[PDB]
Amino acid sequence: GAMAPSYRVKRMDIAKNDEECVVNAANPRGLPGDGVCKAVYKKWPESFKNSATPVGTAKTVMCGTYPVIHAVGPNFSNYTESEGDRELAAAYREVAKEVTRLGVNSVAIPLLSTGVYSGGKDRLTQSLNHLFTAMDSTDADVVIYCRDKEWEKKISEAIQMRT
Ligand SMILES: Nc1nnc2ccccn12
Ligand SMILES: [Cl-]
Ligand SMILES: [Cl-]
Secondary structure, eight states, X not given: OOSSOOEEEEESOGGGOOSSOEEEEOOTTOOOOSTHHHHHHHHOGGGGXXXXXXXXXXXXXXXTTEEEEEEOOOOTXXXXXXXXXXXXXXXXXXXXXXXXXXXXXXXXXXXXXXXXXXXXXXXXXXXXXXXXXXXXXXXSEEEEXXXXXXXXXXXXXXXXXXX
């Protein structure tokens, strides 16, 4: 575990993370995809061997000794708000199990279902709160990776609020 487990946020490419493992915002078929998934495919292509897994699950594949946790959030274009909310919560619970099983002291994580799976809605608060529900009982240092400056500010404020 980390000596004083923390949450941090950084605005940069998750493929350049400084953590002991990465969470991919994966599609269920293990395809290269776009966004986080495509940068992850370019950085760790070996990790996409038998990475396909259902919505609401996480499957870890090693790239050398570096663990890539493929976490499949729901595409809110396809799910009802209610069913999507349940699957998004479940994907993060499966991430917490994998991070714990791997015995890592740190993990790089994107906000699942906030990009091309958002069904065109702002899901910063919904996705971040499900991340906290899952990860709060783990002792890994969590570093959240985001793209836009307003998202970095809002994620940083939500972390600082609970400290
Ligand atoms: N994950 C994330 N970071 N910045 C943004 C901006 C829009 C939608 C999702 N985002
Ligand atoms: Cl960058
Ligand atoms: Cl997404």
